[PDB]
Design a protein around this nucleic acid. Sequence first.
DNA 1: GATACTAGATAG
Length: 394
Amino acid sequence: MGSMRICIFMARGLEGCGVTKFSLEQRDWFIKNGHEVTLVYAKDKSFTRTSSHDHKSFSIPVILAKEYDKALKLVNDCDILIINSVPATSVQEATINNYKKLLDNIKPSIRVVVYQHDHSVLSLRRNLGLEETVRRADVIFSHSDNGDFNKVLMKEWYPEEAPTVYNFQPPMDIVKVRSTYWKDVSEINMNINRWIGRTTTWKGFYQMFDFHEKFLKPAGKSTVMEGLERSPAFIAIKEKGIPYEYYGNREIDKMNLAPNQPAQILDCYINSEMLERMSKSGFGYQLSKLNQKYLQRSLEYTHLELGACGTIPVFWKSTGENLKFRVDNTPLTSHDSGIIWFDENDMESTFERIKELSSDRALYDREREKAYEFLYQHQDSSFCFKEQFDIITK
DNA sequence: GATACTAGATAG
Ligand SMILES: O=c1ccn([C@@H]2O[C@H](COP(=O)(O)OP(=O)(O)O[C@H]3O[C@H](CO)[C@@H](O)[C@H](O)[C@H]3O)[C@@H](O)[C@H]2O)c(=O)[nH]1
């Protein structure tokens, strides 16, 4: 019921993945709804995927370790301070020290909002100041009431009344993407299967490799996996002697899209570039197989980008089973969504589906629309940020 | 003790 000043703060730094995407998507919504916004991030630690999204023209970097004043001056110039990430466990005494001093000098007329974007305790543990950050917050959000942040970490800090933790969904303006990359069914290459994600076990990269060597490759299809970095978690792909063809983001045009080829792995990607390639690929894959406890209503940005750019979304079954439609709590697998639920113990019925859609384009374009409208209903900004804006205000 | 989950050093 009035225009406010917002400061989005990422103390971990600008990593270029989910948290960075949420902030940018948060900034756009606030701006579109009449509010002034400033996006601030700590550059004490740097990241590879720092340019995946375009923020360079408006984001404001700051070195907490040696710019406390500018930092304090920025975080105090708003009505709502939203912290999406906290210093990592490797920043250096000065950084985590000044960040803690910042939380002690945020004027009284500022409502501090804290979003916890991680899932597993293992990730939650690599945070510094997360406890102080949470106690200073006037509002807290998490991906699941039954996730680790809620059931374990909030138990360690509040064994005199524990703050409420509201649930949220990482929203995105789906229409902007569609209206920008969607293509006519004729421009799509039904033989290019494109997987996107990062090198982490719950991201289902293994099953994509398996699915390619056993179904797509043998059938003349081509597979591209975008976003795999040789993180330590990559050693396992070495031990498992899994066939592949790595490509740096510079030599993308030397990638071989012909049949009878191993999984073509792309290092890391620029988000707008990936969407363009995806909007012209027959099927996009996002096999996140997170566990029941961590799943409530939150789909991931990689999930939403697939629906939004005009491809046929191929997600992990269990995921769509545990998650619930935002409109009526019903499982995502209970709707005629057009989505193709991936079954690990039945990759043949999955492949068969892809084959059908691969033959007649009428049904294909009939399934996109249903998938798009379904993902729109479930997680577009228009709805989700308004839900959060209301919890933050009242 | 089995098992998920979590880019860096350095030279051009
Ligand atoms: O090299 C890359 C890799 C990813 N992306 C993009 O980065 C975002 C990644 O977000 P998401 O798909 O959510 O994956 P995570 O990086 O795992 O995001 C984390 O943060 C999100 C915000 O809440 C949560 O939804 C996730 O579960 C959590 O893992 C997407 O827009 C991707 O298109 C790029 O542009 N380039």
